[PDB]
Paper text:
The binding mode of thalidomide includes a hydrogen bond between one of the phthalimide carbonyl groups and a conserved asparagine residue of the protein, which contributes to the affinity between the two molecules. However, the other phthalimide carbonyl is not involved in any specific interactions, not even with water molecules, and thus represents an unsatisfied polar group that potentially lowers the binding energy.
We hypothesised that replacing the phthalimide core with benzotriazole, thereby removing both carbonyl groups, would possibly eliminate the possibility of hydrogen bonding with the conserved asparagine, but also rid the molecule of the “dissatisfied” carbonyl group. As the net result, the affinity to CRBN may be retained, assuming that the introduced triazole nitrogen is less unfavoured than the carbonyl group due to its decreased polarity with only a single free electron pair. We designed a thalidomide analogue in which the phthalimide moiety was replaced with benzotriazole, using an innovative synthesis strategy. To our delight, when evaluated for affinity to the thalidomide-binding domain of human CRBN in comparison to thalidomide (1, Ki 8.5 ± 0.8 µM), using the recently reported thermophoresis-based assay, the benzotriazolo analogue 2 displayed an improvement in affinity with a Ki value of 6.8 ± 1.6 µM. To gain insight into the binding mode of 2, we employed our previously established crystal soaking system based on the bacterial CRBN homologue Magnetospirillum gryphiswaldense Cereblon Isoform 4 (MsCI4). The obtained crystal structure revealed that 2 binds in the same overall orientation as thalidomide, but lacks any specific hydrogen-bonding interactions with the target other than those mediated by the glutarimide moiety. These assumptions are corroborated by the crystal structure of the complex between 2 and CRBN.
Residue numbers in the entry: 19 to 123
Write the structure that this text describes.
Amino acid sequence: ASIFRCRQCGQTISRRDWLLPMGGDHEHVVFNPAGMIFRVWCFSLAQGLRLIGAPSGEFSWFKGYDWTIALCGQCGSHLGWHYEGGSQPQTFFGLIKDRLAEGPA
Ligand SMILES: O=C1CC[C@H](n2nc3ccccc3n2)C(=O)N1
Ligand SMILES: [Zn+2]
């Protein structure tokens, strides 16, 4: 269990090696304004996504970061968000853990 794929279609998304401890933890449990709870895992890098729209700062769970919706580039499943416009690091991915499948390289 080293690679993360899209749970719906099996698109290659990220690696356990690429987990990023933002504020001391890679896992952040967050709620959106619609009251949906997400278990978000922070990654330095991801692939196989499609980033939709222009960045927005509204309701950002990570101070100083603007977000873009990250879909699976293959099946269009909402996998999380790309974050940018911040510092150390400038950019990262917040992916919804339960929408990924972990398995061998
Ligand atoms: O960091 C983030 C990413 C985006 C996320 N968010 N989900 C929404 C659903 C409906 C309307 C606005 C919304 N904002 C959020 O709350 N925070
Ligand atoms: Zn997919």
